[PDB]
Chain A
Amino acid sequence: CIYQAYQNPLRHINTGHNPNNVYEDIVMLGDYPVQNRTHDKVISQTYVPAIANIAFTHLSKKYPQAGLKVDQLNTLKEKTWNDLGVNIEHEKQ
């Protein structure tokens, strides 16, 4: 295992079984395969549409061109207030 790669690291978990200088682990140190979606119950979403509607209506009363609509909740939630030009701090109360 010196200057010649015989085993396949893609079919091994740890490449340190035998001394070598031509093998590297596929899952290096600091790499952690973790599921991107866990089996955790999500918070109830019953009142989220109403909260979004109320907040968007109030904010549109001050920013008519902000385009704050309930139908855009799936896409609006991914943007920040600075991108929308809305100062949520003043209107939070």
Chain B
Amino acid sequence: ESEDLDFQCESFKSQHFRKKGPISQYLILGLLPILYFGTEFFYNHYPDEDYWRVAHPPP
């Protein structure tokens, strides 16, 4: 913080290169539509708790 001058050094090695990392989170990325829709409808019980339940006629 308060020990380094605010500047960019001449050497090009200081360039911030992007390197791929762990791939586990991309599983959740790929499954996001399923997870998001499940949260929207099943988890929040929208629009109601009976729409997604197996239909049974009244007694």
Binding site for B on A (CB under 8 A): 7-8, 11-13, 17
Contacts and interface: CB of A to CB of B under 8 A. Distances in A.
B42 to A, nearest CB: 39
Contacts of B2: 11-13
B1 A8 contact: no
Contacts of B3: 7-8, 11-12
Interface residues of B, number: 3
Interface of B: 1-3
10 contacts: A7-B1, A7-B3, A8-B3, A11-B2, A11-B3, A12-B1, A12-B2, A12-B3, A13-B2, A17-B1
Given A7-B1, A11-B2, A12-B1, 7 more contacts: A7-B3, A8-B3, A11-B3, A12-B2, A12-B3, A13-B2, A17-B1
B24 to A, nearest CB: 25
A16 to B, nearest CB: 12
A56 B51 CA distance: 109
Nearest to B3: A11
A7 B4 CA distance: 10
Contacts of B1: 7, 12, 17
